Design a protein around this ligand. Structure first.
Ligand SMILES: [Cl-]
Length: 163
């Protein structure tokens, strides 16, 4: 556990994180995929051995001694808003369990279901709030990774509003 568990946000490639483990925005099949998933595949390809896992779950595979937590958010193209929201909250709960089990002091995490799986909607607040619901009871330092300046601003504001 971190001495003073915190949330932070950084606008950079999650494949260049400075934390003790990473959460992949995985697909259910363990495929190299696109976006965050493709970056994670290029950086830690060994972590895709038997990484396939259902929607709403997380499966950890080691790359060397570096844990990759493959978290499978729903594709809102396919899910109803209601069932998609349940599966998205469940994926983050499984991430919290894995972060705790591993005993890490820090984790790098993307906002699940906010890219190709968003079904063309802005899901920053929905996804971030499920992340907080799951991770608030953990003592790891959480570092959220994003790409766009206006996402960075909004995520930073949301963290600060609770502090
Ligand atoms: Cl996504």
């Amino acid at each position: 556990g971190a001495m003073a568990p915190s949330y932070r946000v950084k606008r950079m490639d999650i494949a260049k994180n400075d934390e003790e483990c990473v959460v992949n925005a995985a697909n259910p099949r363990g495929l190299p995929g696109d976006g965050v998933c493709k970056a994670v595949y290029k950086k830690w390809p060994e972590s895709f051995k038997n990484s396939a896992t259902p929607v709403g779950t997380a499966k950890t595979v080691m790359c060397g001694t570096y844990p990759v937590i493959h978290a499978v958010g729903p594709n809102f193209s396919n899910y109803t808003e209601s069932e998609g929201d349940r599966e998205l909250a469940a994926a983050y709960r499984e991430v919290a369990k894995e972060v705790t089990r591993l005993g890490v002091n820090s984790v790098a995490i993307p906002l699940l279901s906010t890219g190709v799986y968003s079904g063309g909607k802005d899901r920053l607040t929905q996804s971030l709030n499920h992340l907080f619901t799951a991770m608030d009871s953990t003592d790891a330092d959480v570092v959220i990774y994003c790409r766009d300046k206006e996402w960075e601003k909004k995520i930073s504001e949301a963290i600060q509003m609770r502090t």
